[PDB]
Symmetry: D2
Subunit: 316 residues, 4 copies
Amino acid sequence: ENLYFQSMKKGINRVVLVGTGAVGCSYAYCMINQAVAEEFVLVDVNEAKAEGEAMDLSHAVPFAPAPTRVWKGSYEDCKDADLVVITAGLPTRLDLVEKNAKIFKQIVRSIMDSGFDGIFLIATNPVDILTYVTWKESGLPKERVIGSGTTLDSARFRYMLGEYFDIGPHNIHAYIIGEHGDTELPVWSHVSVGIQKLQTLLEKDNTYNQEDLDKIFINVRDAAYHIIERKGATYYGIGMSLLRVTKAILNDENSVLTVSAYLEGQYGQKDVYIGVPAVLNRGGVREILEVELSEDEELKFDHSVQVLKETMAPVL
Amino acid sequence: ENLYFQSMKKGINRVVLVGTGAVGCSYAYCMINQAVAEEFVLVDVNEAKAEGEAMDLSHAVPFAPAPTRVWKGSYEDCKDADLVVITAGLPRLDLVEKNAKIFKQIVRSIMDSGFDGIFLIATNPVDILTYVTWKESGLPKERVIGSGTTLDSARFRYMLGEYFDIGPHNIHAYIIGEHGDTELPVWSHVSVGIQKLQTLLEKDNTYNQEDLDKIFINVRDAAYHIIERKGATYYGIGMSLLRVTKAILNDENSVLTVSAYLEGQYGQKDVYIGVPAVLNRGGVREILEVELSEDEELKFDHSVQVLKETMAPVL
Amino acid sequence: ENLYFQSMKKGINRVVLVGTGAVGCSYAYCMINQAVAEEFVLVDVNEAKAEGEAMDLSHAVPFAPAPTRVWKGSYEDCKDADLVVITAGLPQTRLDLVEKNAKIFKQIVRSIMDSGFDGIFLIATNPVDILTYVTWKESGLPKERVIGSGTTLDSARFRYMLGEYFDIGPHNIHAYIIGEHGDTELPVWSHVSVGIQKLQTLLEKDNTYNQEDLDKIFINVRDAAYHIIERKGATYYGIGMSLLRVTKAILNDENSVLTVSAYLEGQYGQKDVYIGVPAVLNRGGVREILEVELSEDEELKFDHSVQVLKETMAPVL
Amino acid sequence: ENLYFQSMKKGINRVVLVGTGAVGCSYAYCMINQAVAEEFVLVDVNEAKAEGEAMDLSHAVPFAPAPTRVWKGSYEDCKDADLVVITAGLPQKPGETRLDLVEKNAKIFKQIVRSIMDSGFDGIFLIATNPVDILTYVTWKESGLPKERVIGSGTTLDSARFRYMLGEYFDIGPHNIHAYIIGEHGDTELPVWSHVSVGIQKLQTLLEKDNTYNQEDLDKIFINVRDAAYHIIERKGATYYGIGMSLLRVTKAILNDENSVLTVSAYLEGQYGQKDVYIGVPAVLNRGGVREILEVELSEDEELKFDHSVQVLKETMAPVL
Ligand SMILES: [Ca+2]
Ligand SMILES: [Ca+2]
Ligand SMILES: [Ca+2]
Ligand SMILES: [Ca+2]
Ligand SMILES: [Ca+2]
Ligand SMILES: [Ca+2]
């Protein structure tokens, strides 16, 4: 009775969001449309902002498929949280990192000091390093701190290829790996067009070419640029990527997503959170999927890894 | 072969959006999250704003439940459109006169595209502009629809649900009249699940009309409280528009407080105003009339008269 | 390590179905179509039948929109279960029906309780209200955490048939059947709404509706199973969706309103029996019963429903 | 007025299911849970059954997340139908030859199809009845319709089972296993081992980089797909839940214009070096039915077995045309 209330509270899915701007709120609105989590709690530096955001999302619930309980809370709300999503943060690359780090050192401490023992999903930029921070601050197993990594980049890549191959993006199997940013790399060697092998379609002669494909990846790399170019900021893209990861985690999917994950030998690399294809479930990152990269992608991946470690080097 | 392509194109659902701000884009993201329509086309005065918005939205598609084809287009894309949603305009009587003029360019162009689907108008002052849209289009009145008081009903349901500790999906509650300060709650027809509100307010329960009075004021003035805090409102209506669109596209025969044209119901006529109405693939099937309490009947009649006075110098 | 792996198993939803016939496997199918549980365990005396259903049902999973893990298991798997749904039972005097299944049910519940189960029971086996009471006694569990499907489907049939009559979709018909699930149950005519509109005002204002039609509507709801079973050998699609819907109210902590078998504590002037009534369901089970003021005709009939129920249950307890 | 009302009837999706047994009604049940069509019509020779299945399925509608209009109807109702799903058929009674199985259902199909075309139907046929590839060909002949708009369920369920069992084996959710069964639905069908992915990973590379995994287990996994129906069938009588979801998924690709990839029975025109038969192959489906066949470079072992599959299919079809 005393126990059953406490168990009911724990048996449902609570997501706490920390950082309630457009990326935070785009993701929340995704959660409400799809009714993923029973409780969804908003925490911001700006009280009013988070209060107003929770009001506006709350009014969407009665026209949704099913209820979510959406409210403005605080670090306190994280105790029985299954998942903590952090977009929160502030704007040389080192100044960005070293600032976000101390900011993240406070955020994480308070969440740990709440009795939180769930999963972290880190969406703040630079995502790969801040996931590493969150891990190195939380004291949690490395499989339990996750970054959005190159998921959105992979989605952008699938959309674009689907267009180029005139096929639904849901049937395009395509991945980008490495650090999220200008050093990420398309895994051409493992692109599938439905059942079809990219390299075979390239073999055949038949209007496809690596030149059209290179253009596609640059269009991925610089997507944010174009949107920023054209509406001021970007959020709809990541909102849905953060949702897909959350489903993977909360609904224990064993699904493959290119999250920020900690390498322990795979791809010949280690000691980094980096974008790689990984199986996700209720426990977090179950395993990183290794593939034989082409010698070219190998140089590209290894280069991404070493630049990342160089970015961390003076900050940690 | 020639025909089958043409008919396949027609067999699916195309939604054109005209007006691509937060309100428009929140609705678009709801359609994408929920994969309602196969084609969703964005048009705005800003080529680049519509282009960026379709880019950002399109990259959500590969992680959505099912595909939608999302692109930036033009009034041209309105020809095979099943539903045109309009949130557009430019920022009581002053605003009304220009919004109306601009709506005459918008509507004509869409008509001149060969469009013969349904209109959903979401631009404030919603009730007047739905009337405008109708008067310009030449379409039957049941095929031009406004968002009306759907969002105020949902807010009302959300708050009552809190008050009664019950999911809002089980609160049956409506606000009718003109969307704005003149709207009114239909207390006489509020159900708390199975429970008649009045029978709860007669019992020995901890409820009282004064708590409820404060709830409607909190409903009426909700968007003030939200703007005050985050700078605007768009999530609320985004889903309200989603709801109307499903009712229409999926032929639901479902009841929603849209803006519909009165031809006698509630003792009133010759306005589009918020009322409970059955929607389906054909638009507004019928307005549902209820015996309002004497006070509810007095407030509805007032809302109507104010509306007509607002429209008088414009029409 | 182990402590995270065990918390993982708690941090997902698991349903275990006892009885894998027509009814439970239909429920299973909705549960797979709708991706409601991460885990779905089929239990049955006919151990081969459970293996085959789990095989056949699992095969639908890759083409479902989201995955569920589905396997034939045992009562042991109830340890971390959030909900047990029981459908096992012996077909149709009423008194013999009751003894045969109370015996069965007592063994079922005891076995479940042994594994360490500390979740919610949902009962569907006819006689539903009686068997819900039986389960409550044997489990020792709080009354709230023990629920029957009650008249939820009668209620659904009622809304559908009313939907047809008034020409609006059934999701907008607000209407309830209450009482002992069977031929003593009743429609609460006094609290039927057609969208925003009240049934009583509709019958009285300027139009052509008559209670005569409406009374027939209830008889079709009451005889529906009979009407179905004569045409196609049993009724099961409707009941599956009923169970889907009760299951979602509990696991998704909805606080929604369903006419499930719920434990009376003086609501409607009656007490100390399980019977179909409007209840509010959440993750804790039944959060509260919703009492309404029944017309004197409805109160007479609910009274009768409760007295027959008590008289049916008494000689066997 | 009635030109809007008539256009409304076109602006919604209507499916008419022919045959209301275990298979068709499981499909119906999926269709109701997922709110995929506005209208759903049950048709059956045994008019009693269709009436009660319609009643039963209808009663689930109010508790579905969204509504569907469900009724027992007739061929006449195919006029504005978008899709006719045909599940009517006759069992292969043990002791009888396939040629009698094929023959019973060729004649029945011919008249069914003729009856349908009569009412004015101008939509797409989805066929599930055994023999699926052969009966899809029968429907194409009789309807006179374009090859694209006449589709069988093919190996789609086999592909689903393959993914499921491969999922269990690699410990990844099936939705992330990209794997395909092709050929004639039955005991000549084959897995395209050359084109199996486990998430990102290529099955060949997975085997080649150090491991326990051996093709030996995988070969066992494929045998269990081919055999699964009989494996399910003894433990519970008939198999239907899987095929119901398969029909749901193909319906969704067609009515929702997905351009998604599904191993349906599709009319070969030189792909895989074979032609002029309906057979299970990876195809792109949208609102126009089959948009195209996706040809892959099969292994030599795969190319041999697909040759055998088509050769046996062509030979079984012959004496009954
Ligand atoms: Ca939890
Ligand atoms: Ca869930
Ligand atoms: Ca259309
Ligand atoms: Ca659990
Ligand atoms: Ca149609
Ligand atoms: Ca649809």
